[PDB]
Amino acid sequence: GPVIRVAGDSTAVGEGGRWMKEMVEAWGKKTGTRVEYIDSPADTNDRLALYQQYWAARSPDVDVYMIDVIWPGIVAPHALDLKPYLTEAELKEFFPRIVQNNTIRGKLTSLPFFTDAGILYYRKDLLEKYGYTSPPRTWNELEQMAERVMEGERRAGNRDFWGFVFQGKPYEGLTCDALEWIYSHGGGRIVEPDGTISVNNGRAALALNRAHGWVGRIAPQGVTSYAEEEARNVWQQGNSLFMRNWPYAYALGQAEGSPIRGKFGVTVLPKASADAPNAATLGGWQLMVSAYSRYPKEAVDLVKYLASYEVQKDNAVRLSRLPTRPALYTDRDVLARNPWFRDLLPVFQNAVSAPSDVAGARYNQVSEAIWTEVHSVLTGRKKGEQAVRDLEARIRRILRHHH
Numbered sequence: 001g002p003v004i005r006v007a008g009d010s011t012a013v014g015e016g017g018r019w020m021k022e023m024v025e026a027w028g029k030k031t032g033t034r035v036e037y038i039d040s041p042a043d044t045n046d047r048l049a050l051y052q053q054y055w056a057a058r059s060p061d062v063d064v065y066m067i068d069v070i071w072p073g074i075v076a077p078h079a080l081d082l083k084p085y086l087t088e089a090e091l092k093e094f095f096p097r098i099v100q101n102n103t104i105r106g107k108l109t110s111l112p113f114f115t116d117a118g119i120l121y122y123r124k125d126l127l128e129k130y131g132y133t134s135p136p137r138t139w140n141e142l143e144q145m146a147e148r149v150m151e152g153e154r155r156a157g158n159r160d161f162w163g164f165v166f167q168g169k170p171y172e173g174l175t176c177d178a179l180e181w182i183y184s185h186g187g188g189r190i191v192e193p194d195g196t197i198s199v200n201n202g203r204a205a206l207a208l209n210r211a212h213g214w215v216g217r218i219a220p221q222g223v224t225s226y227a228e229e230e231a232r233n234v235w236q237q238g239n240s241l242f243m244r245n246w247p248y249a250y251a252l253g254q255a256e257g258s259p260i261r262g263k264f265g266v267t268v269l270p271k272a273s274a275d276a277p278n279a280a281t282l283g284g285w286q287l288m289v290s291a292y293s294r295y296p297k298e299a300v301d302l303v304k305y306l307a308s309y310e311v312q313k314d315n316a317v318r319l320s321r322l323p324t325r326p327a328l329y330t331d332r333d334v335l336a337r338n339p340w341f342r343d344l345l346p347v348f349q350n351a352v353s354a355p356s357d358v359a360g361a362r363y364n365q366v367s368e369a370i371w372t373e374v375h376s377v378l379t380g381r382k383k384g385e386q387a388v389r390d391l392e393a394r395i396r397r398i399l400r401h402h403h
């Protein structure tokens with residue numbers, strides 16, 4: 001019979017690839033359908049380039065892809081329209097915001113699978129050790145706490161200890177981190193939903209200068225090459241007071257044998273001042289049936305299974321990844337394992353999107369300009385003032401004539 005082939009997630013990032021292959025094999029076994037899992041690189045922008053090779057070729061060699069929240073506008077021609085396969089009731093079991101994100105010119109490109117939001121991880125043991133009763137609410141507090149804890153821990157002999165780790169590598173994750181910095185300083189959304197390129201302002205510049213101020217000071221010098229896993233590994237070994245990262249790192253940090261099990265909490269990222277908005281960049285992954293699949297009916301059945309209540313539940317319980325079904329956020333088992341899903345639900349609801357809707361199919365070019373200009377500030381090559389001016393000019397060129 002048919003072999004249903006899936007490219008989604010990565011064995012190079014936590015347990016995602018392993019768990020994904022597990023779920024796909026379970027569907028295979030339950031339905032009597034042969035399946036194959038194709039692995040992907042860690043970073044989303046590398047995955048896009050890979051999958052683009054299959055799409056350009058109209059390749060039938062992958063039936064189902066896991067696609068980023070930022071991709072629907074790019075990948076829509078390569079997606080089978082799922083709308084005819086779901087009832088209105090079925091489709092309403094997902095968050096409307098994500099279904100809308102995934103719907104391009106009326107085409108439902110993909111089902112919501114898991115959502116994502118950037119959050120602050122913090123070592124509760126260390127805050128208590130150094131006299132702090134709450135995680136930081138402002139970036140200045142984060143810096144003050146990081147400096148004091150680092151001084152103490154370095155003095156006690158942990159030469160590997162840092163204050164803060166994050167994603168500073170030149171790739172999509174830096175765009176995510178940087179949107180949070182900018183937005184949390186009152187600097188806007190880089191490109192606003194209405195099309196306005198707003199990033200050339202003093203608040204955005206300050207946010208970038210502040211981040212440069214971390215590098216080699218409270219954050220490792222090598223943070224400028226860190227993606228999600230590099231940051232997680234320093235944190236997870238016990239060597240960072242703070243980390244910015246996504247939900248998936250929670251379950252990994254709690255696993256038996258983690259040096260930091262039971263020593264950490266999560267909260268909203270800090271912000272410049274009390275009246276700035278809270279920033280959490282909206283991430284997440286969706287399930288797309290290939291327009292080039294020879295087996296659309298079977299592939300849709302697999303995508304419905306993967307997006308089902310019980311598979312999303314497993315993803316939440318075992319991998320601490322955020323459901324795209326509101327009903328899971330009241331599930332007793334999801335909540336007992338991850339109580340912070342309830343505490344931070346409003347953070348997740350107010351998460352801020354990168355400018356993929358407004359940039360559409362040119363989003364990957366916009367984002368590359370963003371991470372390259374931000375990176376040049378993190379390296380000390382440019383000041384924030386110059387970088388946001390240069391970034392405005394690049395984005396203007398990229399989006400000229402885009403409506």
Ligand SMILES: OC[C@H]1O[C@H](O)[C@H](O)[C@@H](O)[C@@H]1O
Pocket residue numbers: 043044068069070115116172173174176228246282283284285
């Ligand atoms: O590295 C950036 C990526 O991180 C996570 O995978 C998010 O879910 C995704 O939306 C984002 O693009």
